[PDB]
Design an enzyme around this catalytic site. Sequence first.
Site, mmCIF file in Angstrom:
data_model
loop_
_atom_site.group_PDB
_atom_site.id
_atom_site.type_symbol
_atom_site.label_atom_id
_atom_site.label_comp_id
_atom_site.label_asym_id
_atom_site.label_seq_id
_atom_site.Cartn_x
_atom_site.Cartn_y
_atom_site.Cartn_z
ATOM 1 N N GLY A 13 19.930 1.981 59.697
ATOM 2 C CA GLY A 13 20.988 1.280 58.997
ATOM 3 C C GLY A 13 20.621 -0.147 58.637
ATOM 4 O O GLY A 13 21.029 -0.646 57.589
ATOM 5 N N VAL A 14 19.857 -0.816 59.495
ATOM 6 C CA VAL A 14 19.456 -2.186 59.211
ATOM 7 C C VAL A 14 18.463 -2.228 58.061
ATOM 8 O O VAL A 14 18.395 -3.221 57.343
ATOM 9 C CB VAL A 14 18.823 -2.894 60.442
ATOM 10 C CG1 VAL A 14 19.840 -3.013 61.546
ATOM 11 C CG2 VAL A 14 17.604 -2.142 60.922
ATOM 12 N N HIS A 63 12.770 7.075 64.691
ATOM 13 C CA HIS A 63 14.204 6.953 64.438
ATOM 14 C C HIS A 63 14.789 8.146 63.680
ATOM 15 O O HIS A 63 15.050 8.044 62.487
ATOM 16 C CB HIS A 63 14.458 5.659 63.653
ATOM 17 C CG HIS A 63 15.884 5.195 63.665
ATOM 18 N ND1 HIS A 63 16.891 5.854 62.995
ATOM 19 C CD2 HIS A 63 16.461 4.114 64.240
ATOM 20 C CE1 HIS A 63 18.027 5.198 63.154
ATOM 21 N NE2 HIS A 63 17.793 4.138 63.905
ATOM 22 N N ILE A 114 16.640 9.765 60.696
ATOM 23 C CA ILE A 114 17.789 9.038 60.184
ATOM 24 C C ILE A 114 17.304 7.664 59.744
ATOM 25 O O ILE A 114 16.883 6.864 60.580
ATOM 26 C CB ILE A 114 18.861 8.853 61.276
ATOM 27 C CG1 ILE A 114 19.440 10.221 61.670
ATOM 28 C CG2 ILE A 114 19.951 7.906 60.777
ATOM 29 C CD1 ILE A 114 20.288 10.200 62.937
ATOM 30 N N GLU A 134 18.478 -4.328 54.485
ATOM 31 C CA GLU A 134 17.268 -4.977 54.008
ATOM 32 C C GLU A 134 16.989 -4.627 52.556
ATOM 33 O O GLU A 134 16.609 -5.495 51.768
ATOM 34 C CB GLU A 134 16.079 -4.567 54.880
ATOM 35 C CG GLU A 134 14.743 -5.191 54.491
ATOM 36 C CD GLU A 134 14.708 -6.710 54.642
ATOM 37 O OE1 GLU A 134 15.381 -7.245 55.548
ATOM 38 O OE2 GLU A 134 13.987 -7.369 53.864
HETATM 39 CL CL LIG Z 1 21.325 3.790 62.183
#
Ligand SMILES: [Cl-]
Lengths: 148, 152, 150, 151, 152, 152
Positions: B60-61, B51, B57, B65
Site C-alpha cells: 500500500g505504501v 509481500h 499483494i 509512492e
Molecule cells: Cl498493504
Amino acid sequence: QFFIEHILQILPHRYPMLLVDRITELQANQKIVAYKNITFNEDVFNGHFPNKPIFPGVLIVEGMAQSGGFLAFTSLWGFDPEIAKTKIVYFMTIDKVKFRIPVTPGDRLEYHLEVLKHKGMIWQVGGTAQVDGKVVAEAELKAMIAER
Amino acid sequence: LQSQFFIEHILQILPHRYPMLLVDRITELQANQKIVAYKNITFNEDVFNGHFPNKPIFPGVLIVEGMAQSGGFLAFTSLWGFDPEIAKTKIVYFMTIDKVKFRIPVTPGDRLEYHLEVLKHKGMIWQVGGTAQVDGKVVAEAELKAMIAERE
Amino acid sequence: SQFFIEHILQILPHRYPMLLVDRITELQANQKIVAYKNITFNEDVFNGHFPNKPIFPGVLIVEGMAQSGGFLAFTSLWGFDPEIAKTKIVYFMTIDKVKFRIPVTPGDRLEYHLEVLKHKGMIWQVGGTAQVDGKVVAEAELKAMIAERE
Amino acid sequence: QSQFFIEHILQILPHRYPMLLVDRITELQANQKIVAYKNITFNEDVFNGHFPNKPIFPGVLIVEGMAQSGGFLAFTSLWGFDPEIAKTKIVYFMTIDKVKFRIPVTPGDRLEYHLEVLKHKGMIWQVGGTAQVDGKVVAEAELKAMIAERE
Amino acid sequence: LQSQFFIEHILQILPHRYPMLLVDRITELQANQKIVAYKNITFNEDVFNGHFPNKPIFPGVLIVEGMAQSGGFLAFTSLWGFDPEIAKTKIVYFMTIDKVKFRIPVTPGDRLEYHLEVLKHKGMIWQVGGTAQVDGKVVAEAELKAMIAERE
Amino acid sequence: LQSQFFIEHILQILPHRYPMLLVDRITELQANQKIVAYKNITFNEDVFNGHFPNKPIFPGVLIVEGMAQSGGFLAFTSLWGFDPEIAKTKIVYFMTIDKVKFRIPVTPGDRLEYHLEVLKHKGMIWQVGGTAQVDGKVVAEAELKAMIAERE
Ligand SMILES: [Cl-]
Ligand SMILES: O=C(N/N=C/c1cc(Br)c(O)c(Br)c1O)c1ccc2ccccc2c1
Ligand SMILES: [Cl-]
Ligand SMILES: [Cl-]
Ligand SMILES: [Cl-]
Ligand SMILES: [Cl-]
Ligand SMILES: [Cl-]
C-alpha cells in the site's frame, strides 16, 4: 528484547519488505519501541536515488506499520508463531505523517508507536520514527490482521 | 507540452530509478492542474518475494509512492516543461501524507491507474490529492505534499 | 574525520552490493581509522546465509575491514580527493591472523577499527578488529597495495 | 474453470521469480486454446540490462511466456486444476519454430498470450499462437512440449 | 581485428547489461563467417531462484538469447571492427527464430559454448545459425535473424 | 562415498543458498584427505554490479569463502558420508583464516577451481589448506580452521 529470528516468527513480511530488525521495548496494548538499521547495502538505494541515497519516506512508514503490527499480534495472542503463520497484514489508513529529516545509510531508524485505538483485528497506532534522539518522522495508521 | 508520455519520457524527468521508479506511462496531463498515469503490476517484481510469500499483494505504501511520483512529474513539467537537462539534477522529497485509505488490495495482473489533482502549489512545494484505480474502481485515496529540490 | 556515505562513494570504487562501509567516524592520517557498516535484515546476502538463520558472512566482515583500511591508506597520502581517487586502485595482496569470535546479525552496528602496522611506498599493512557494541567480533591483518587504475 | 489468478498459477506451474511470466488467465478451453497475460512494468530486473535507457522486454521471454501458457493449457487439459498432481509433473519444451517479432514490447504494455493446441499425441503436445498487445500481434511462434514425471 | 575478446571488450561492443548480458568470452571470430564464444553457468545466478527451486536448469530461451548475442557481436565487429564509439549508438533487434531444439538440459557448472555461422547477411540484417555445446556435445540448435538499429 | 558430486548433491549438503552458495561442482573427493571442486564465474552475477563498474573482478574474500565451503563439504562427508538428513542439522563455521594470498585476478569466463587438503582433524575441528586455481595457475592460497557445529 526480540531479535530478527523472533520477528520472523511473528510478522508475515519477508525480504525485501521486512523492515524491522529488532524490538527493544514491548508493553501489551500500550506501546512498542523498535528499529531497523539503514545501510548502503540495500537494493532500494539503487533507485532512491542514484548518487544520493535517501531511505524512502514511505518505507519509514511501512517500518512503523510493521512495528505496530508486531504489537497487535503479540497483544492479541502473545508470542504464538503457530497462529502468526496463518495471518497477514493489510494497510487500511495512513494519516498525519510528516517527514522532517532525511534518513540515510549509517542511521539507526528507531520506531516509537503507541496504540491509539483497537478492536478485533483492526488496530490504530501512532507515533514517531527517530534517529539518534531526533524525530525524523511522525505518523498515524490503522492496519488489519487477516487469515491468509 | 504533450499530454501522453512513455517510459522514456518519464526516465528523463523523474530522478527515481529501479527498484523505485513506479510509473510506467502517462495517459493524460493538464499543466498545473491534473495528471493521469499508471503502472502495471506483475508477479515478476522483487517486492513480491516478501509481500507476501504465496500471497502477492502490492504494498500500500508503494501505491502512495507511485501517486507521489505522478504528481512529481506533473510538478516538474508544469514548472520547466519537458526539460531533461534541468531535470537531471533534481530530486523530490516527501513532506507530508494525509487522508489515505486503502479500499481494495492490488495484485499481479492489475493496471494500477494514478489520478492526481493539484490541490495547492507554490514554488517547489506541490500538494496533490487523488485516487489509485484498478478497472475503474477506486482501490486507494491519498493526499500528499512533496518538494522538488536541486540536488546538492 | 567524519565522512558520510556520499564522501565514501567518491573515494572508493566499490558499489552495490559490494560497498561495505557506511560511515567513517574517526580518521588519523598514517595512523588509524574507525568506521562502520550497519547490518540489517534487508540485505540480499541474508537470502542464502542462511535461510531461517541470518548471519553476516565472516569474509564480508574482512572485506569491510579491507575497504576501511584501503580508505585509510588512500586519504593518508592524498586526503579527500575524488580526482586522484579515480586514477588509483587499492587491492589486497595478503590477509592473515583472521579470527572470528562472535556472529554478526541483523540489528548490529559493525564497527571497524584498523591501524597502520607499517607502510613502505605504496605497500601498506593494516590490522585491527571488527567490533559490535564494545566486543571484538573478529580480527585480521591485511596488506594492500596502491596502484594506478588500469 | 475459465479464469485463474496469480494464486492458482502458482499452484500449477513450478516457475517462480524471476521466471514466472504469466500473471493471469482469462480464457481456458480444455484441449483447445488458452488466453492469458503478463503485465510489463519498468520495475522489473531485466530492464536493468535490456537495455539501459531503452527498456525493451526480451523477445525470448515472450516466447517463454507463451510456452508457460501452453504448458498450463496442456496440464489443465489432462488433470484440470489439481495442485497435488501438479507437483509430480514436468513439461519439457523440445522445440520452437516459426517465431516472428513484429512490434517491440515495453513498460506499460499488457502482453496477452494467445495459444491453441496444434497437435496432441501421447505425451507430446504441439502448440502455436501469438502474443498480442492491445489487439495487435507483436509476436507469433510454435512450440512442442513433452509431459513427463517430475523427479 | 583479433579473434579473442574478454568480458571487458564485450562490454564495449554489446549493449546488453546485467542481468541480460549472456556472453562471457569470445574464443574465435571470422568476420562475416563464424564465431565461437561461451557463457559460464553458475548457481550464483538470480535466474535460478525460479528455474527451478531445488532443481537449477538454465532456461532454454536464454540459451537462444546467448546465441543471438554471439551473433550480434560477430555482426557488429564485421561491419565496424572493434569500434566502441559507434557501438554506443546501437542495439540489436531479434527478428525471427526457428528450428530450435533443446537436446540436453544445461546446469550449474557447465561451460555453455556458442557456435554460430552467418547463413545470410546484408546491411544491418544478419542471419545466423548453429549450436550451443557443453563439453563437445550439442545441447541445443537454433537459427535466428537479428537487426542492428540506430538507438536514436 | 562418491568422488563426483553435482549441484543437486551440493544443495543437500551445504546450507548455503543464493547468493552465498559458491561451489558448482565437486570433481574429486578423498575422505579425510582432499577435495577438488570449482565455481564457474560469469558476468551474470549480481556481485559484479558493484565490484567493479566497468571492471568485473571476482571478490578475493569470496574466493576464500568458496574454498571454505569446499573444505566444509569435505569435512562433513568425511565424517557422515552423503547423509542429507544429518547435514540438515549441522553447520560449519570459520574459526580462523591465515596465510591468504591473492596472486591473479578472477574474472567472468574463468573456472575457479578449489583445491583443498586436510592439514589436521580431530572430531568436529578441521584445518584445511590449499589454493584457488584458474587453468592450472594459482590465483590464491589460504588456510582455514573450521568447526562443525549444531544448527539448533
Ligand atoms: Cl498493504
Ligand atoms: O585489479 C584489481 N582490482 N581492481 C582493479 C581495478 C578496479 C577498477 Br574500479 C578499475 O577501473 C580498474 Br582499471 C582496475 O584495474 C585486483 C584485484 C585483485 C587482485 C589479486 C591479485 C593480483 C592482482 C589483483 C588486482
Ligand atoms: Cl522520500
Ligand atoms: Cl561466516
Ligand atoms: Cl529482443
Ligand atoms: Cl527451458
Ligand atoms: Cl578483491
